[PDB]
Ligand binder design. Structure first.
Ligand SMILES: O=C(O)C[C@H](NC(=O)CP(=O)(O)O)C(=O)O
Ligand SMILES: O=C(O)C[C@H](NC(=O)CP(=O)(O)O)C(=O)O
Ligand SMILES: O=C(O)C[C@H](NC(=O)CP(=O)(O)O)C(=O)O
Ligand SMILES: [Zn+2]
Ligand SMILES: [Zn+2]
Lengths: 146, 310, 146, 310, 310
């Protein structure tokens, strides 16, 4: 596509203006081998599409379903020998630990040395996240706002 | 081993209908036949990082009626957390090497859950964390409703006041949704309404609830009228319009209440219950406070004793 | 190498791990056009390069010069309908308005609504940066926030 | 139009040897024979957002000794910036529609420089901006030096005290590095030493400067001993070790001082210049303070009158 | 004697369409050609018991631009009322024996009205009394409107922000209701809405006013968009929900504004007028601030000089 690799992952169908967020959010910059980023690529059905290619790397257990919460229709293509060895589409997990910040000012998660952790319920219109410590439940819009 | 032995009592959410029923059955037994030695030689820490009179003194009287020992604080201004920057994680890590259970009240929501990550083998019992939960308030209110109503199912329960910051009603509603057929009436000013996650749960469960702008609307319908206090200390400045009680209960308004009906209140009360109510047969709030001794004795008895023969 | 382009700019020869910094710092990604970034891709000349093809956008001299504090030897290139018109290169820019933040905590620039501004001088070895307002002079490395 | 006519006076860094010499010549002219109505019908703002006895009152006496009117404030607490959140930018935007020129002292470095962005054609005269510059201090310091040494070129000048935060030695070191063959001796604690950017500037201009650990090791070769006061208002907690004066001058140390050498101090002084020095021939700081009237009068005359005091 | 000669200027409610028109005509006369000695030998008191940058400094520049002398204070903390318990009544009684007229801003509503009870023949000019009136603000607001619209009759004027405590919109709404065929649009949060007494007055005079929930729904028909700032100093705790600006104007909203329409603001502004509006053709608040000098100069001229600036 816009580049090829012997082995690596290719995250395609990334929504626009989110592509650049993933290089920071997964720190795909602490790397030595090549990355190909194509931004605002046409995708006839979804117009704007960003796409990332990482040579020699495959996304870990975390990032794949953490990607579910960030680019719900992205398609992760595992490649080896230039063959699409696996294709994946992320599922929403039961929980997301470490990466999200509790919106509640008075949650102890903000003062003490502990990893944040939220439960993921896929609540009719949107994902609701319940914080493991203060027990409040929030719209994912709120929890992963920018 | 009984189901509650060494459990952490953190949230009503983690307890089932039978854990709850086990506490009430035990509280009833110890209310009738006392056990002065049940916890002979256990030392229990009472750590109150936020103001309390009734939760702290009912808890340490319960410990003393069962032969236990108490060490602790009611004011974190003099701990090494207060003056030297000890984290709550290192505070709990150290205190768990000394004692057999930790009773904790703290101002940030989530504090007792955090304590359990550091606690080790020591059970942590939540005397209130910010505006989240107050599990031991619900075991004394459920013992009181049972005492007066002889039933914990099919009741008409009205909850009045600051329902957004009230940890007592967040825990009580979650517990009464475990029994069958309870009808809830929530009367609160908009700003201080029931948080949506409690409502979502009532609905997902098929429980009936409704909102009302007055108490008169529901006075003849209710079995329990649960009054709460505006949590001034938890309010945001934008909520300061809501500091004064919006719904005040006076003896006059008890005009056509069912005879069995009781007015419960976790206390302290500010202006929401006039003192003339105190002299009516409906006022049950100081008998309720008294029941804290049996509900808390029960919980301490069950968490630290494998099998209990009572 | 990497993906084709008709009209625009292609910033080639960016030193490794700096291509990212530049996408962010001069906001190059906040566009509705197609950018292709090749991170960590082999150069030869100085081992490994990183590079950006920004399609249908052209830089002024002034923008291009601003890159000299990061990628001094970068090679800007404008291609009007595929052929190379002008291959340019950064010269350090005399002033760097708006991009950096004065590390003096008591500088007035932090409170008021004025844009930041620094005078740039090759200070003998490092590039020194003097704030136009508080007049304190700083090495370019510290001004690039810690 | 004379060279400084309507220029902003913000930093010594923007004035040439000639601009300084001009101010000085006009100071001597106006000291010799007055001009009471030179600025008749002008109204000048005195905007002191930071403490001042001498700079504000010598500036306002100069405005009054030339016929101008003064409006202003000495304290920001009752300005709308103090109580209402007005920005310094909107403050200068409104004051620029009223007065003929703006004198302002402010606690942040950079404040007079941004007033100019918003002041229109109204000149902004910097009465001190945080720890950055103080250009009118240097104009009276230079007038007093010229007046007691005859020259401004080929001097030995020692600067003692807090040179990191001393805005007076920032401007003055940059003014004397404009004349030829001046030698610099700097006596400060390491934590309050001269900022790199002034030493660099001394180096590319080829000027000879040196660090010294005592006043005594340079007492015999200096012509100007310019003492400063630790800027305690500006110190960080880290630096609180340096609140007391390390180098304190007593009259005995002057017993081998060059007979022309004078002791200058911008003032206030706290413990660094003992009061017995006050009675000795080398003491010139109150004379120095008085010369503020002539340099500030000259500066206002040049920035606001097209012509040139003959 | 001209009509305003020695009148107290306390509320717009006591001045006629003619009294306002007079002030305005004199403002244009004195803006066109100055009068430096019109108030020579008068001494005017500047008594600011509440914060001020613009009203105090534009008033004192006007007094100075007409030859008068100023005496006063900007802060009450070091007055004998501040430290000794002097009453405002005895304060005005003593100051009336010294000065030719008294300008005073004060935090209580009613303060300038009672100064007149104790000021003898010395006129009292109200520079703002609590949340009641601010008559000289309206005189420069009207001069700026007349100056940018040509008329004061038949305008569309929207007033946005805190209208409950905005003393500026109290006076200005009452001044424009003196001219014919002006239409009013009021955009405020319900808690900070126009006081009943001004709406009544609009109604018996048959004036058309309407409430609107956005600037955008009236952006195309307004000629004057007069923005105000929430009077946070004056808010009750109840009202603290309204401290942030609900209606914030950014330059994009002006993209369908009438080409003559100007944006006025008494100032200080905090978040309600974004700084990008500052570069657009509709922005007229700093021009407006400048016109304070001409209306205040005209007012002093009329109250203190018998004659009439020709
Ligand atoms: O304070 C309240 O209103 C209810 C409740 N009160 C109590 O538990 C009684 P006390 O604060 O005396 O321990 C609480 O949630 O803290
Ligand atoms: O305060 C000092 O030490 C030096 C200097 N002092 C003065 O200008 C005298 P004043 O602060 O009384 O106006 C200053 O920078 O403010
Ligand atoms: O403060 C305001 O918002 C409006 C108005 N503002 C002014 O008059 C400007 P100042 O308070 O600087 O004199 C006032 O009523 O004081
Ligand atoms: Zn949380
Ligand atoms: Zn700076």
């Amino acid at each position: 596509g816009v580049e090829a690799i012997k082995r690596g992952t290719v995250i395609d169908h990334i929504p626009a203006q989110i592509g650049f967020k993933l290089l920071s959010l997964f720190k795909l910059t602490e790397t030595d081998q090549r990355i190909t980023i194509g931004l605002n690529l046409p995708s006839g059905e979804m117009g704007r599409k960003d796409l990332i290619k990482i040579e020699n790397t495959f996304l870990s257990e975390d990032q794949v379903d953490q990607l579910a919460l960030y680019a719900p229709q992205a398609t992760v293509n595992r490649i080896d020998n230039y063959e699409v060895v696996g294709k994946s589409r992320p599922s929403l997990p039961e929980r997301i630990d470490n990466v999200l910040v509790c919106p509640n000012s008075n949650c102890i998660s903000h003062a003490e040395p502990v990893s944040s952790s939220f439960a993921v319920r896929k609540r009719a219109n949107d994902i609701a996240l319940k914080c493991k410590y203060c027990e409040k439940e929030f719209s994912h819009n709120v929890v992963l706002a920018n | 081993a009984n189901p509650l032995y060494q459990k952490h009592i953190i949230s009503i959410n983690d307890l089932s209908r039978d854990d709850l029923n086990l506490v009430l059955a035990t509280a009833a037994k110890l209310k009738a036949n006392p056990q002065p030695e049940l916890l002979k030689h256990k030392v229990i820490a009472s750590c109150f990082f936020e103001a309390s009179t009734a939760t702290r003194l009912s808890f340490q009287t319960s410990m003393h009626r069962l032969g236990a020992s108490v060490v602790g604080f009611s004011d974190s201004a003099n701990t090494s957390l207060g003056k030297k920057g000890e984290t709550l994680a290192d505070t709990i890590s150290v205190i768990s090497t000394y004692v057999d259970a930790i009773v904790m009240r703290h101002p940030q929501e989530g504090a007792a859950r955090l304590a359990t990550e550091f606690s080790g083998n020591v059970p942590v019992l939540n005397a209130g964390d910010g505006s989240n939960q107050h599990p031991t308030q619900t075991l004394l209110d459920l013992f009181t409703i049972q005492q007066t109503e002889g039933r914990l199912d099919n009741l008409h329960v009205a909850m009045v006041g600051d329902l957004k910051y009230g940890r007592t009603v967040h825990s009580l509603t979650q517990a009464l949704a475990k029994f069958d057929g309870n009808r809830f009436y929530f009367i609160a000013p908009d700003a201080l309404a029931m948080p949506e996650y409690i409502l979502d749960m009532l609905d997902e469960k098929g429980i009936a609830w409704s909102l009302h702008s007055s108490i008169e609307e529901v006075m003849a319908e209710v079995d329990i009228l649960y009054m709460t206090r505006v949590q001034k200390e938890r309010l945001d400045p934008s909520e300061y319009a809501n500091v004064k009680a919006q719904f005040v209960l006076r003896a006059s308004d008890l005009h056509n209440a069912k005879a069995n009906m009781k007015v419960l209140h976790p206390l302290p009360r500010v202006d929401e219950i006039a003192t003339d109510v105190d002299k009516t047969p409906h006022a049950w709030y100081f008998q309720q406070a008294g029941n804290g001794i049996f509900a808390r004795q029960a919980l301490l008895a069950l968490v630290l004793n494998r099998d209990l023969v009572l």
